[PDB]
Amino acid sequence: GAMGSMERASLIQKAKLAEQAERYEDMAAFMKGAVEKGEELSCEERNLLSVAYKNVVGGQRAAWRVLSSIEQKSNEGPEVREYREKVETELQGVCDTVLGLLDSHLIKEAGDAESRVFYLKMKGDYYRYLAEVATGDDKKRIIDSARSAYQEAMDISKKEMPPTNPIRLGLALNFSVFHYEIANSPEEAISLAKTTFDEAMADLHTLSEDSYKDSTLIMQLLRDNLTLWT
């Protein structure tokens, strides 16, 4: 790896700098290097990993959707399809890289609920991004891989975390989006969002002012989706 000669601490420091500079491809490369040092990641480090790849894949997904729409309109030369394929291939490569980091070896070394749920949610997320562009023989298996990762994360989070935990809430939010637009299960999506919102509501009284702000921020995303979906 091109980051093999840099100290772990310097990679983390430079990831934080790259975030401030909005250099998210650099940020992701630095955090990939940090993961490849082989040590477990702290809470803050896990968030840096997540933010970096979310921004990288988010730009690719937004581009793919623009190109796919143009391509669709043009089917109502080969250049549109070719360029959509180029972006799609690059996106799949990013998802494969993230999934490879989780499988080698973040998940197997993650014993605490906060770390294991975080990584299993990420695994579901990046299989979901693969499913957004999937069309061939393996699409159903891609979908089931996302479902399986989300489900294991949900099972742990329900046993080990309070209903206001922000990781638990963000997991439920994304699993509900999975149901709605990947699995064609809008009723499951709505039920999960509502149950998650209501159980978090009833737990807010246990929280500090800061935790309350953290949880209600994500609850608002659940509510906004319910308003869009109902």
């Binding site: 933010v51 979310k54 988010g58 963000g170 994304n174 989006v177 637009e181 995303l221 989706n225 979906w229």
Partner: peptide, 7 residues
């Protein structure tokens, strides 16, 4: 557009 956690 619906929200996911990262957004």
């Amino acid at each position: 557009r619906r929200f996911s956690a990262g957004m």
